[PDB]
Symmetry: D3
Subunit: 157 residues, 6 copies
């Protein structure tokens, strides 16, 4: 049973770690797939994002961090994933998640979307807000693995 | 890997069948658990709902239909389940499912909630709607397993 | 071109009047159809609701008030309607109206659902809210047709 | 500056306590007003709910617990309140609270509605959910004031 | 009775065809109005979009495809439209639709917003997602008229 | 009791005036804080926005208009504000408001988010839409203080 948990992870947060951890507890192998080139210039480069994610999940044995540049469904297919992990925060745009899951189902029906729920602690935080706050002199240490926190300070310095 | 898919299933619909089927694709064993739910004054007795669900899922070897009047979390623990399946049709489902999921996580943290999305075909039906239509002799054959439609026909005048 | 605007109208409010009025602007004939709705244990009997609606819409020559206990879709077909009018106040309405609209489309595909939006003035009222306020002697004259307010006054102590 | 925080509080929960506490931080006096709400067939009598709320808020010197069967707007005016406190957990709350707030503004324009947000810890609980869990002997000690949990234990078998 | 169904239609999809078809069944004349210059550079030029839309609706007699560059309300007014067609997918941002309808009502009250619902098949697809997927090597043939599919391949080649 | 009502106010609208007016009625001092440099180039400059806002609130004695460039929470802290005013329109993105309030609570817990509701008249209008319409030859006089209307015409001329 191979699951894929895709995203930009720019950068990976405690919320993402929460979700991938839950995924590793119900599925044999989990591929944390990092989108290479997003429509908008990411704060960290793919190599940086992969390194940070690898370090943050080093303790999770059945987790494999990989980068990809094609349509997520095309990558999932070549990787033989049959489960698609989506994290649903309390502040998630549910309508958008439905659009996405149905489009992904159209593209690869053999890939089943599965939604996991983070702990209440990370249920109201989005990576976008974390970055905006950090870029504007706010403390976001609480939302990030220590390794990511250190990399973020260097990036904004 | 044992998953539990609880609900009132009054009566079980093609939407429920869609969800439990997707559940069997990713988990070894799935327990379709029917709660007595006296507070909801169900149209069918627990025994009737269990019988209906059993016949509607007889073709699914990985599914086990059972009824329960206990706290769902205790029943799940006692059934050795570690995955809690829920279906999401839209926003309403999502909000209510989050409250329920967080309460269950508080009661049994090792029971991980997982939300699945039905096909577009069943994204707008519910037991309540089917019953209302049936109370007015409307044709609901399209939304229910053969045995369930028959039972509903009989149940009403 | 005959349209049907079904509901429980228990009792009819200025919000309902707003919607039916907009309906008459674009369709030749509009049937305001009041469902018996015993499952909702209406405050007013069907006969009372029809009488109230008739007087509240007497000034609208293109409106015809009628009561029905049949499946709404069959009543619409039997009334030769091809347009199904619904009012949308907000999200909640939208989600529920989609389930209802798709069920009706399954029952009668040639009955096309159309959603209209009320004025800002009536975007937050409902029969339920008006009744709750009235049960406590609150002034609801502003939200109801004169004849309806009188009837509500009488109905309560 | 007197604020009123009305509700059915059947029974009062840590979520309610969170909101009323935040209310006391910005307003001089806060009246926790418990409505009889017979239409909701409360589990506890008004007298029981008031007693429970009184003990659960005894440590809050700025809070005054009272019961009422009048129109909330008239009670607020008669209590000399000019601020109406409401708690928002999510979307559902927001939509319903807007209808209620606009009706109250129509009944008493000088009573200004104010919405507060609970901690993440209590963002997913409700009296209804706690009662359902308790009806099945589930552990709800974490979500209720000590005195309330005891009373709930007793109330049920 | 003249209705206007405005949008960017970049490019026109099966969902748009679904909606305009329903509009032609309840209104005498329907103007499929294509916005000339959108805030963001569209994939197809206005001439291309008009040609594609014309071909896709060639079978609908009471449909007129026209381009416009001014505020939609200004164009609707000069065109003497009294009905404004809006398609409401299950994944629509309802709040935004309300903002839009009320702004359009402020600008031209004689233009009544009417919301139609697409079939379940096209209820979860947005043009934006269709384009993104196509641009990223995904199959979107299913969502587009054959003429649009062919034009899209040439555009991305 | 010092409250802060932050935003871009580009430009200040009748809706903003509605909210700040309500805030001045329940709090001793209200700081209308105008964000200096927004992620996107604003229509009016900070000086212009401050001047317009000052003129529009000149009649409100306990209102102080000030500009700020740092993270809102950092400014609120240095200004010793303990109340954060947020206006909640009927078309507000509630999920986003929850994200924001929780992030602001993380950054400065001593600052309590308080949500106020505008009148029905301004409940469906966003500054973004007002600007878009104005820039595209639509009449938005109704939504703006006369001083802002005059400044807007000059800006677009
Ligand atoms: C009975 C329970 C599970 C609530 O059940 P519910 O009413 O949601 O069951 P229902 O038959 O309506 O639905 C079951 C599931 O199928 C989903 N579903 C229904 N129709 C569809 C459809 N057409 N497509 C996809 N999913 C669907 C629902 O969203 C839900 O996730 C709950 O009250 C419970 O756990 N009761 C036992 C007592 C207890 O322990 N209570 C405390 C719980 S915290
Ligand atoms: C009675 C029906 C139509 C449900 O009615 P409903 O409770 O929504 O009626 P109600 O009076 O509350 O509202 C009627 C319409 O007016 C709208 N409305 C109410 N207030 C407002 C307002 N203030 N502004 C705008 N619209 C409003 C509602 O959203 C609805 O669209 C439905 O149950 C039905 O069709 N019953 C007959 C049996 C049947 O065939 N059932 C199966 C249906 S699939
Ligand atoms: C009783 C009233 C206030 C409705 O009360 P309600 O059921 O919402 O009370 P309830 O105890 O459920 O909640 C009270 C408040 O606390 C909030 N709340 C509940 N749990 C939480 C939580 N965990 N976190 C944050 N807020 C919460 C609610 O959203 C609400 O704002 C209303 O019906 C009323 O005013 N009744 C009197 C008669 C009247 O005048 N009616 C007309 C009113 S317009």
């Amino acid at each position: 049973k191979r699951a894929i948990y895709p995203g930009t992870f720019d950068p990976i947060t405690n919320g993402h770690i929460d979700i991938v951890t839950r995924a590793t507890q119900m599925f044999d192998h989990v591929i944390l797939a990092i989108a290479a080139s997003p429509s908008k210039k990411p704060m960290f480069t793919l190599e940086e994002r992969v390194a940070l994610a690898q370090q943050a999940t080093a303790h999770l044995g059945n987790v494999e961090v990989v980068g990809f540049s094609d349509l997520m469904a095309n990558f999932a297919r070549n990787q033989h994933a049959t489960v698609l992990i989506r994290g649903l925060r309390a502040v998630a745009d549910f309508e958008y998640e439905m659009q996405l899951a149905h489009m992904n189902r159209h593209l690869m029906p053999e890939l089943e979307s599965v939604f996991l729920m983070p702990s209440k602690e990370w249920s109201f935080i989005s990576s976008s807000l974390v970055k905006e706050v950090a870029r504007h002199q706010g403390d976001v240490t609480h939302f990030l693995p220590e390794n990511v926190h250190q990399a973020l300070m260097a990036k904004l310095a």
